[PDB]
Amino acid sequence: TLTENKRKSMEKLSVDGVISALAFDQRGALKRMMAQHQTKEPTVEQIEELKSLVSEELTPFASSILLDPEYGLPASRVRSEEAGLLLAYEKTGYDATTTSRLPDCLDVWSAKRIKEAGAEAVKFLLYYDIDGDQDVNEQKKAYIERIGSECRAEDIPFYLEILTYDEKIADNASPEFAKVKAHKVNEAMKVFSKERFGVDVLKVEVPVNMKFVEGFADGEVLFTKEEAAQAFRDQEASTDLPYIYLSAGVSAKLFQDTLVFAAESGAKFNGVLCGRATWAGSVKVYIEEGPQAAREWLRTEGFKNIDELNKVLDKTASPWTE
């Protein structure tokens, strides 16, 4: 049950119980995208500006925006007044030399400081392999307990993002991983739905790799529609917390088709925290043609993209408000 302040914050992040949030806390990933289109290293000024442009042009069409404290603070101050704010709390990436992918908060940040920076939610990404090293997972669970406790104290919603993996499978897009994905996703949600983690909303993957599902696949078919549908019902049965989907490994259209398939299957998901697909194309335009050009792209292609997603969400998502 939400405290008064957490409920107020949840309300600021959604519309009629549905979270239609724009994810733009990309840091290293965004810089790498930018570097594709110019010779000089992308600058802090360029990065901050592009985030500000996306925030200004697209938040009128989003219930909230997720930004990073590193480059995203100016962008947060120019968001639509109707849109709420989440700030990321985790350091990006993971050590490729090991399989542990341990969580680490930004060095000079705390839940209190995230709140003071005007956020209505603390977001934190955790990599989790339910079948992995038990001592590694013990450390991960302890770390999430601390964060959930911070958020309880600061009275600010805790959005926990879970990205699954397997210590022994290098490629999550592989058929090998696809066969175990539902297990990884749904069992991880079951663990992190425990009261002791203090989570208010789970940001999670769809529990199936739709590219291998009958009727969605163009190549090999690993699952029938009924099998895929059962993975969604299992996911729904894994938690009683609000949860929202992130998009990965799929085209904007497939993600939208997945949202429809999810709702048809019985998943009562409560929205999305989705980004790249919507503003991606503006990065090239910003680098090559400049800010005003980027605005124009966002006002046209950007809007068209977010609009189509919104219409789908509007007919697929269920409200977290019971």
Which residues of the shown chain bind a second copy in the complex (CB under 8 A)? 105, 107-113, 135, 138-139, 142-143, 145-146, 149-154, 196, 198
Give dist(CA 76, CA 84) in Å, integer. Answer: 9
Query: Bridge partners of 273?
Result: 21
Task: Residue 138: name its binding partner from Ca ion, a second copy, none (Cβ under 5 to 8 Å by kind).
Answer: a second copy
Residues 6+ apart with CB under 8 A from 211: 173, 178, 217, 218, 219, 249, 250, 254
Q: Does 80 bind Ca ion (CB under 5 A)?
A: no
Q: Does 195 bind Ca ion (CB under 5 A)?
A: yes
Residues 285-314 within binding reach of Ca ion (CB under 5 A): 310
Task: Residue 190: name its binding partner from a second copy, Ca ion, none (Cβ under 5 to 8 Å by kind).
Answer: none
The token pair that represents 233 in the structure block: 């019902």
Q: After which residues is the chain broken (C to N over 2.5 A)?
A: none
Q: Which is nearer to Ca ion, 69 or 302 (CB)?
A: 302
Q: Which is nearer to a second copy, 80 or 193 (CB)?
A: 193
**Per CB under 5 A, which region of 28-36, 176-184, 194-202, 279-287 contacts Ca ion?**
194-202
The least CB distance from residue 151 to a second copy, in Å, is 8
Q: Which is nearer to a second copy, 37 or 146 (CB)?
A: 146
In the chain, what is the straight-line distance between the N-terminal and C-terminal CA atoms, in Å? 11
* Dihedral sign (CA 184, 190, 194, 197): positive
Is residue 136 helix, strand or coil? helix
Task: Residue 104: name its binding partner from Ca ion, a second copy, none (Cβ under 5 to 8 Å by kind).
Answer: none
Give dist(CA 116, CA 156) in Å, integer. Answer: 11
The least CB distance from residue 159 to a second copy, in Å, is 17
How many other CB atoms are found less than 10 A from the CB of residue 45? 9
Which residue lies nearest Ca ion, judged by its C-beta?
310
Which helix (H) or strand (E) covers residue 208, if one does? none
Of the candidates 146, 163, 235, 236, the one whose C-alpha atom is nearest the C-alpha of residue 198 is 146
Task: Residue 108: name its binding partner from a second copy, Ca ion, none (Cβ under 5 to 8 Å by kind).
Answer: a second copy
Q: Which is nearer to Ca ion, 25 or 236 (CB)?
A: 236
The least CB distance from residue 89 to a second copy, in Å, is 10
Q: Does 322 bind Ca ion (CB under 5 A)?
A: no
Q: Which is nearer to a second copy, 113 or 179 (CB)?
A: 113
Task: Residue 195: name its binding partner from Ca ion, a second copy, none (Cβ under 5 to 8 Å by kind).
Answer: Ca ion
Q: Name the H helices within the chain.
A: 4-12, 28-35, 44-58, 73-77, 111-116, 134-154, 175-192, 225-236, 252-265, 276-289, 291-297, 303-316
Residues 223-242 within binding reach of Ca ion (CB under 5 A): 236, 240
The least CB distance from residue 194 to Ca ion, in Å, is 7
Is residue 125 helix, strand or coil? strand
The token pair that represents 264 in the structure block: 């048809």
Q: Which is nearer to a second copy, 108 or 322 (CB)?
A: 108
Which residues sit at the interface with Ca ion, rule CB under 5 A? 195, 236, 240, 310
